[PDB]
Amino acid sequence: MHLNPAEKEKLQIFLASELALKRKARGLKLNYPEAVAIITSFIMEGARDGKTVAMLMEEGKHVLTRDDVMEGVPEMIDDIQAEATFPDGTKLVTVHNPIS
Amino acid sequence: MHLNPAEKEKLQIFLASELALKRKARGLKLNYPEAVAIITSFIMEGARDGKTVAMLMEEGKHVLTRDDVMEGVPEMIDDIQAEATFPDGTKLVTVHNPIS
Amino acid sequence: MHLNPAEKEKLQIFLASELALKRKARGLKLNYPEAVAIITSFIMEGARDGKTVAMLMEEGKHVLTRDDVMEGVPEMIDDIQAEATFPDGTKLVTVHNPIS
Amino acid sequence: MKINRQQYAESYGPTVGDQVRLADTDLWIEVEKDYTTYGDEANFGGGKVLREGMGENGTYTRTENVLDLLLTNALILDYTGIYKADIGVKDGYIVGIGKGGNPDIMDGVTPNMIVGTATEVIAAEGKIVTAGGIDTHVHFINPDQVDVALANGITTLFGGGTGPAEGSKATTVTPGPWNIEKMLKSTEGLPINVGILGKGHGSSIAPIMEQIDAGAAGLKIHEDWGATPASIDRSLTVADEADVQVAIHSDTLNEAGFLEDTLRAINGRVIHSFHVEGAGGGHAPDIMAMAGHPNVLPSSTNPTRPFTVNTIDEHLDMLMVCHPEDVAFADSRIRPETIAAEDILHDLGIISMMSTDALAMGRAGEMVLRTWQTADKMKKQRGPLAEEKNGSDNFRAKRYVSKYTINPAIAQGIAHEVGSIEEGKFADLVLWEPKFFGVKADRVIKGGIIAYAQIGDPSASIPTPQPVMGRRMYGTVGDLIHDTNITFMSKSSIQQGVPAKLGLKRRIGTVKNCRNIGKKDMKWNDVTTDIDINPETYEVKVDGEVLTCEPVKELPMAQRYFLF
Amino acid sequence: MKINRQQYAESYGPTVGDQVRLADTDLWIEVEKDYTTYGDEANFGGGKVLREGMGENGTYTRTENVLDLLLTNALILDYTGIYKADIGVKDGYIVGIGKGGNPDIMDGVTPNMIVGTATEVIAAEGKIVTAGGIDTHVHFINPDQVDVALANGITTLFGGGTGPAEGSKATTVTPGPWNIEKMLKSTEGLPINVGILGKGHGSSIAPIMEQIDAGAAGLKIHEDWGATPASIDRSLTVADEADVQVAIHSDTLNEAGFLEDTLRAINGRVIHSFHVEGAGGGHAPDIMAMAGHPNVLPSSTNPTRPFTVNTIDEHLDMLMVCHPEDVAFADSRIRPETIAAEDILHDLGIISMMSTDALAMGRAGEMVLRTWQTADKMKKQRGPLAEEKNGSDNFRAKRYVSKYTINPAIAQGIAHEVGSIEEGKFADLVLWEPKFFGVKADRVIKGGIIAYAQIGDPSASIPTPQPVMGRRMYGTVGDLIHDTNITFMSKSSIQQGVPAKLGLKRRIGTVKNCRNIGKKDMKWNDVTTDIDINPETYEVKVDGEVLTCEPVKELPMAQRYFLF
Amino acid sequence: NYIVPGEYRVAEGEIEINAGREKTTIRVSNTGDRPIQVGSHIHFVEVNKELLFDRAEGIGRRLNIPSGTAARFEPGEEMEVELTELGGNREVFGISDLTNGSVDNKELILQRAKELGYKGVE
Ligand SMILES: [Au+]
Ligand SMILES: [Au+]
Ligand SMILES: [Au+]
Ligand SMILES: [Au+]
Ligand SMILES: [Au+]
Ligand SMILES: [Au+]
Ligand SMILES: [Au+]
Ligand SMILES: [Au+]
Ligand SMILES: [Au+]
Ligand SMILES: [Au+]
Ligand code: NI
Ligand code: NI
Ligand code: NI
């Protein structure tokens, strides 16, 4: 596979996101790290799909809403950032205030 | 996400449990580490759901039975212990003889 | 669980394979590391199922075809090798030219 | 030109009279005073103040009153106060708390806090800064325990162990000269401060004392090695001669004596009483009465902290990794009455310290976490303390922060080096985002260099992208691990040249002044009293008054934060 | 007062006549004798025996017959016997095997096994304790290989390599003075014992000998560097002068000679024949005939161990990470007849040693695992050995444990330090739960300190919660890695001051006494015989008798245990 | 045929502890209001002051129970226990500081016991 350090670390984010999504599927309001994992994994999968940075900046504001997360979590998350390989190479996505 | 060391390690248990559950779904009798992963992940997900220590001590005795595992595995597992964050903080769950 | 070093590392391969399979399910042509993960995990799960080395050497040539992967990927992958515990202990499987 | 207060606090962190919530608790701390000059605040970045000729002095060499590091705009939470200041570090020590910058052009600059060519900057605006936590009940069982401790703001581990040997798994003991030397060598590779306790057991002086001379920093008396009148007496005779502390886990079984017998053997000498509530060990059922005595420095371990609906059940099966005589023993040992009363004794200043009991019956990364959970539960049940003003919890906050910073340092004889944000002390500092306060440290500074940080993708353009996790930083790498950490040792081992003899390159700290202290020396936690524990009902009274509390179903600093 | 045997064994581990199953095999070992005094067994914990004034002596300083560490109630499995004893360690060496405790009050205490203030305790009741494994066929290709070895109970790596260079990937060779010095320096960071083999190739003495003087512990002759008559002869001349061992992987191609030519070049001198069956390399097809000669110390590498349904197929494609002439070569090299016979030669004591061939054609963490699989297969096919009594497999167990402990140590010239649980030897010890025996070590002790352990969550109240995995312990951290591990070196390099010259801080072990040994010196595996390998059919005969075996479809110590 | 990995097959019979040593049965009272557990290998005369028994009968002795186990006395409980003889050198040091030498020194042990108020010295 030739995994480099970032590829190994980022597998963890996907895994946390899978864990969080199962928790959400069984009706739990999500916590801080769960919420961050879900939105971060959404961004990296979006880049893998070939979306633009601009699309992911918009879509990242609509992955989770306040009713999906515990009290205070929306206000704990000011930004989520992720770097991933787009068709045109690595780019940084920043989503400001992803959950209202 | 702010993962601390235990949060990173414990992702592995969830992952082993997912692997074991797929193995069980395709009709395999489960081995020692597979069995331990399934019951351990069950406990930590139970704490995340807000169950009490007392409930998980009872339920942990009924997650796998001897017909789900290979010969000798029930007798190899004297106890399974896991710590997880309950609504009232970290607590230890010990399940004695989880598989008969 | 008593995980040894190889058991911990190899969890990563299963995880990469799960990630790759979701990518394939949503219609993406798979890349080099995705392809290698899928075929490698197939082999280790095959050994867990109790197949022979000979079966997995044949089956490994038919897990992905050229239409499942991006241009050039078939030619990038000359062999995939994996060691796993068969019913008769650890054995090495090598699949030559797994994707045509 | 005026700045309203909301914007001021956003930009520079809060100022006098402003309050800050601690994580998701209902505790509020209030800025008591501020060392700044409004308009000359220090800050770093493009077009900002700490630039050559401006807030950065371009004239002075590092020797001329210039800092190695300035933390700008820190909200300090310490036994000494809750206040806003810049913190200046040099030679790995806190040298100035005040107002940093350039006396060329700024008013109110603390004279030894010049930002110069030699000065690094950490922005602490909007952060709370505390001393590193001092955990005095550590079992050295698994080296993975160190990062766990660092991630929750702990910077000093005092205890014993050789790894997962049964002696070490039960007791904070590194026994004898050879095991001690081996663990001092091991310590060279651990990115945290350390002091090692020898075995406080024997009926002749020399087998005990030789551990102190070999480089132990104290002793542990533990019932599993025989917490008899003789072992107690010989250990305290050694400690009085060597100027080190003794910790005790007393005879739970009451085999050779009851509590009054243990106090008689102690004979008015100083001692640190571990897990004084007694679930973690000690005279059944009345050990907690220790905490009323003037010569006792009392600590809690953390699993009883605070009292919750799952506490008893978890402790019940926990005492089975151990197992009619068994049930009776368990029932005599795990007591809702004493665990309940333990909450209130903390709030009253009767138990002076927290600690973990890491990997033996306590959680390496939860000393700080549970201190604040306890304070929050006490505010919810008891209301603001009488002493409070302005609707703040400053008094309770100083009482509780003392339990894991200054009080353990005083008890152990190391408060001249560590345990508080004061001038002259080693620069072990923890930055916290208020939203993560007491849960997950932002940056842990050891001897003036960051050792541990929650930080993101190392392959990214900037350090904030995911995944953000706890990681060892440059202070832990190569030889810098030696300069940023302290091995605390007895005066005799230092005078006998043990560091050179073993090739230790770590900073060597001297244990001293811990024979001449008592309960009265515990900051904000100095209360002596008659504690009665009813032998039939286990009801706890303090000067004739019954102390009851009740368990809570939920805590802050829990499921909002943790992935498992 | 009497204790029935079931409860006795539960509490203190088994005693004389009791049997224990090895993992999930059908091998049973029986306690041959017990050094205890019934009623004075040592044990540690609350209200237990090793307490001051009781089983722990409170009088004696560490010099007075007091131990640094006692392993209580160990079931020892060793070439020297299968028996119950306490094991006492001091200064990193085994000093006493017998009965530990306090002569004040106990009968039968071995005089130098006093538990004192200085003594740490490991509870070994219910554990099997063996020597650390000695792997003499190691390619140093990937540092991740060390934990793999530790997790399966290996404590000494002998071999060669500079990392994943092609020379090292094919051969156990660190070539020449500079590569050797560099790898001795590297070794300072590896938490296992090490000895390095130079290149056993050349036609003049000096290019070979200078490797020994630079600090190599032996030589490797490998066909990939030219396993010619000259290289064999010059290497053995060097080895006879330097008192180090030579390992050989002979000329598979028969280019410069057949087996008889190789034996002529050897000329009756001592040599270790690697992977003697020959799949791993050597004169096609008859290399295995080496194992009959009195001057040959024969080892197997592990992938042929034991013979199973998948063995041939895996070896066939394995020899393609390599590739009519190719097929013929492969068919001449991978032979069911010799692999089958290799099983039986192990059982008969004709092949004396196991080894890995780690990362070149063998598995770093499966030397011990496959030794027991082989013994179990042989019992299933051949029945109990003639020599057995009492329905036990003690004789086979001593023959097989010898193959990876004492016999490699003898062959390499290091058995004065390592390879067995005997008084006077270095305290490299592996504890095993019987249910995991030979699969996953519980605790690996290096020089008297735990180096590696299967242990759980470092953030937990106790060390048993999940996840339980192999982890490095304090023996591996900081400077303690130097005191707990041995670099084995030639006498000449030691006399010439190479350790000081390179700044090595590890314990330095002397290679010696390995020119004056033969097959007869291999414990329980000392059989010399005429081995005939038919050149047409590859049929193996031993003194005129045909040896056939058959592959098994399943092994114990496999899918019940492993996650992959 | 069912395989329990690592199981024991113990031999038949029983293990006699402390074989060949004199045994002595005595009555012992916990006069205290808190429980007392006494381990197998504590010099019996040096146990908790509030245990009342004939202290002379505990000299040179310990409980005749399996190594590492303990007898339990609830508050106010009186019961019989069986003692066996100490072995080795028959010396005790430390613990409660009543002996610090040979156990043969009965009069000196009892004098210290009585002075410090260990119950049941005659
Ligand atoms: Au306990
Ligand atoms: Au316990
Ligand atoms: Au119970
Ligand atoms: Au029960
Ligand atoms: Au405990
Ligand atoms: Au080959
Ligand atoms: Au090859
Ligand atoms: Au072929
Ligand atoms: Au072919
Ligand atoms: Au090969
Ligand atoms: Ni304790
Ligand atoms: Ni403790
Ligand atoms: Ni070879």
Ligand code: NI
């Ligand atoms: Ni090799």
Ligand SMILES: [O]
């Ligand atoms: O403890």
Ligand SMILES: [O]
């Ligand atoms: O090899």
